[PDB]
Amino acid sequence: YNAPSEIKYIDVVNTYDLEEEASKVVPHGGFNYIAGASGDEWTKRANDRAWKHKLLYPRLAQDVEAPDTSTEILGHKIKAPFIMAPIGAHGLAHATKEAGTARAVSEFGTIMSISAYSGATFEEISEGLNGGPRWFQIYMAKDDQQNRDILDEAKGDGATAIILTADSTVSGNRDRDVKNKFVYPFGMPIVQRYLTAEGMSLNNIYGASKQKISPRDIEEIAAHSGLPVFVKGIQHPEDADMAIKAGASGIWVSNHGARQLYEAPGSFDTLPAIAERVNKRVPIVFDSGVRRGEHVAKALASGADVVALGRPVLFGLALGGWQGAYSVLDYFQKDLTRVMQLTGSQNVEDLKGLDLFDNPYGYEY
């Protein structure tokens, strides 16, 4: 597996163009694993086109200058209201793998989410973070003791929150991966105890993780870890009520980048109903489709506290390693700064109160 190895900053004009650029340096199978989604990818398109449903207003004479992008979540002060989404197997994108992404995220000044399906060990990632804050995303074992062990190792590494990804009890129908017969070209050291991953398909990896996740799992992870728990993959408001009742300390609105259930809504369309149900009882992280500063703003305006970034950071990693990934984070901060100035937002809380224009015509207008 010939992963890219260039380390360089990149001049990001927009994040969309990074996809085709990365396609020229990432091996075909791996690239399509990263870029692809379920079915014919209509719901991935829906994640993107959802942003045109609610439109931002420019606002004038707002007495605003030098907008402050910084915010705080679960005690962590971060440079902008976005974090790194949990993504396994960064080694598909770049030889420096999760340690590269970790270096970008910590240097930038936000929170790194570590996937249980990382191709790097806790020690390797921690070397890249150099003290930076991190949250750990568990894919649950069937065996309780193994979940206890993974959680203890995560916390001992320094995790300050646990993310339970519950929308992948089985694999999505990822036609690119089926057609390419994709299999991992390396191991997953954190979950190996219950599988190695090298040569396995993702459907069999998700297959070893727990299918019968219930609200008791949320309660049990919360009690065992003593850390705030996010429940990730929520698209229906009832699950936010369920998660909060079961002791969750945050809601993570996501459709897994459209890699899971097909013929489902664009994730952004689901956010307002979820935020209304949550009603600020706990923090909300939003993901699945964020590509612009305007998207960050619209998410916050619609009830998110922060967003999580995925594919664009991974494409940045492919093209330039840690410096490429950092270039993408920096882009988002600068992009957001512009949008804050033009929308009349002095600070992150102002973003959360913006009026949005309803566009009933959709993408073709």
Place this chain on the structure above:
Amino acid sequence: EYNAPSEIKYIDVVNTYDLEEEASKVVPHGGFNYIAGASGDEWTKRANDRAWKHKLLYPRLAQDVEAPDTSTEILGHKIKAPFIMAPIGAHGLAHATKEAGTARAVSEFGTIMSISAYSGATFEEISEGLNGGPRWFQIYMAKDDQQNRDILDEAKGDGATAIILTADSTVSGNRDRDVKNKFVYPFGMPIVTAEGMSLNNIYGASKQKISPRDIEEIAAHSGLPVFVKGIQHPEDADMAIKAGASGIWVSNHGARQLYEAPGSFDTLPAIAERVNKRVPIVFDSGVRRGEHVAKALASGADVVALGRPVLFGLALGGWQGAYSVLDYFQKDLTRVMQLTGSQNVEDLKGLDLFDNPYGYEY
């Protein structure tokens, strides 16, 4: 000479849409387009497909679900999954084993075979393929009353446990591909010569002046439950039940009949609300994915019926190819059940759907 493919093999289905173009490589041009095509410029066939994006499924989490059960029961038949085979004539356009091949797939899978009155096979040939599997017979009514009595008696003696009255084909749809290819039927219809006849003249020999009395007459004569097939307007569901139907079969004939009509799935909720659980509902016209099976049940259907994708599987692999399509739908549905929080088929019928007012382009 019509020379259909004859190879029997399993196929690895990634999705059923790709089966269309794959099947086009092995089926004679004329026959293929007869199967694939629809009325006018096929806008309503596209509508059947795009309607699925009007109501979107939610993923649901921590639902305490594992190993979802796809089994269900309809009019006392226990079936492996909530889909049956739609009645389609002339399977011989797809594969040399014709309706017997589809029958074997359906029977071995474990669902119900619907036999078209316009099958290219006899009841005896189809029965060999079914090897005892359940079957329903779909009638295209004759003008002559005794002929209807005779066909129904033969169907029932063959083992039919329900009758399907297809009433949306009193004349043929405007099927441009068949006109432009100058296609005509290459073999007979022995249950009802058909060979060398256009479909429009075939439908011409059947009864045009179908009335509610016909539903009453078929039910009384056969002593079997009768489904009325082709329904798109809720008043017809009411009429059919009042006339003695034991089931409603929501369909636009795969968009092969009236043009510039709705996508079938968009018609389902108003029909199910009108039926008000009085009789079972079968839904068809455009089902291609497990997501579609789930959305139809969530919208008031009890089962769906499959058509073109199974024929395309038959073309590619005979009974084994058709079986592969049925298996694909069962596994596809299983995934969807797991991700939506559905442990069983009754759970599918209760799912919330997300309304998408933006339609296909979003």
Place this chain on the structure above:
Amino acid sequence: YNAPSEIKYIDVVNTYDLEEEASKVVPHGGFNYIAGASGDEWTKRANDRAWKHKLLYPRLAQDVEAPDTSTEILGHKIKAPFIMAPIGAHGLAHATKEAGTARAVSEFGTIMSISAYSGATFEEISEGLNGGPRWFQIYMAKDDQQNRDILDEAKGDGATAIILTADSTVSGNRDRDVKNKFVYPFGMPIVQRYLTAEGMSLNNSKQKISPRDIEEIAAHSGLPVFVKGIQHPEDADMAIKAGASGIWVSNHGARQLYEAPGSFDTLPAIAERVNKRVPIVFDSGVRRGEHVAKALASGADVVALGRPVLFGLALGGWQGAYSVLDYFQKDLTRVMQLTGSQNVEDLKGLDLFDNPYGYEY
């Protein structure tokens, strides 16, 4: 101007395909004059896509067989609920011009509408009609005596209604014709007196038409008057108050005001306002039997056919044009059977399914 000249029936699978086929035989300028519309033709596309806003239901066990397409309008018995729209310069499509269309229309058994801008004389058209019914479409002159004279000649020819086309007081912005520098290759003998049109552009007649003109035409001719080009219901009220005997809903095939609605979308509001006081003719975008049915279900009494008939005339002279009329009758017969309509009055009562998603569904 090398117009098509051959005469033969044609196979019509659908009318949309006639446009491309006609383009291969009609001279470029004249073809594009017939086919084109204002601006970038968005409103011509809207005329077409409007049919997907309201969708037909198949209906079952309706006790229907051998549907009857026939109807009557102002006492004329016609074979199907469609007439020929008034279109000038049929010579652009075929050497036999309006006499060819007239033969098709009379042989079929409907009403011929004669444009004041016809390339043929009344006598030439009359020999094609062989006694068949005709209505005369006037484009008003500024001079009152010229209007009197034209109406007298039309009535003398046998017109049994007058159609006042009032949506062309100035020309639409027809980019194809501007880009092609289109000019008529022949004269317009009926309106000669006030212009010869050979060498003239269409944009080069009365602009200040008022309701009084409707009154004066009705009073002078003693014939029923249709007011043609209506898209707003207030104009239906105005026209009926002014003595009109019919309302002709139309946007001139999208050749007039640009960035306006598709004609079918305007029909229900106009039919509501008319409230059955007078008959309604609908045009602009009819291409299928389904469209005929939908127009009737939405308040029209008949529709008028235009471009597809002209494309048929290009392809086959009167027999070509006849094939198109026959196509529409057969197409409607299928639709009637499948929708549960025994007769034309049943079409007028059909439920339609609302499609809020539009063309891409």
Place this chain on the structure above:
Amino acid sequence: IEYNAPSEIKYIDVVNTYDLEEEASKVVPHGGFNYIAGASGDEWTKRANDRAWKHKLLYPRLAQDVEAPDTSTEILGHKIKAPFIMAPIGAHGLAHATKEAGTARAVSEFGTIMSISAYSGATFEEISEGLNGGPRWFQIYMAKDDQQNRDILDEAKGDGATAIILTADSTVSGNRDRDVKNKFVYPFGMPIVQRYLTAEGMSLNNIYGASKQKISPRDIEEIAAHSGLPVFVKGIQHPEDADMAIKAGASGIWVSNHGARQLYEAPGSFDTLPAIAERVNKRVPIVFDSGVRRGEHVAKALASGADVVALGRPVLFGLALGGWQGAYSVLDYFQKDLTRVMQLTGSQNVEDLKGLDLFDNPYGYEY
């Protein structure tokens, strides 16, 4: 900074304004052409500006007793030949060698108002020569220094400005991908704002960056008080800003999204107009811009609450193709296009336009 704008002067036959874009691309240098034509992001909001016109459709009306429609109107005491004015646009020398004096001559001779951008590549004296006494409004991009604003406003008023336009939607630049990809810089100076920067060799983000970011309602008040001229506030898309501007002493509201050159993933400008017009409630005049390309658009804007529209890109493309005569051709095209529309809609005069029923099209562009 090599830059070779076209120089030929000729009338042009305008069939429609859309076609002028491709035609101008043949003769305007690449960077400057794409600076004029382009917009933010992937230009979805520029497309929205254009497709918004299909949301509300015109009715033809019959037997209206209308002939020879009169396009003349009046705004803040200026009698103009048609209900459109020239939008403020800097650096006209990117389009044609004759620069802002070329456009000024066309606008003046046609008989409407010239809006002069603070970022003009021409001095007041050079523009005034082109105007030959014609009416002018001055568009300020504010300095941070109060005295420099007073000086600019004084010079503008001395030159003959009869209104001041505060463009407040560009406190920082939009994300203009074409200009980033092309590394666009201005090839000449901006004499009116040089005092706070020159612009030659500078990127627009750094010129906007020198202008005032922290614009507040007090700036509107101070401009109005200092100049003693009516002040428009330009770039409004949200009705609250119309309330704000009037409360602060504005004499007019200029609805605009800057040609989609500023905030991305925002509504098409025409879609915002009715809510603004409802809030304004005829307290002050409304200028509308961003996407006007046809007489139908002028009509629809007036029917939806605007008093006049402002023209931008199509006039610059005309300038590129023919200098002042090319620009004149574009203005004339608009007057004739509007006249046709007025005849067919039953509109005898500009006030009738403002009263037109519109057909609501909930299907949008694809219908």
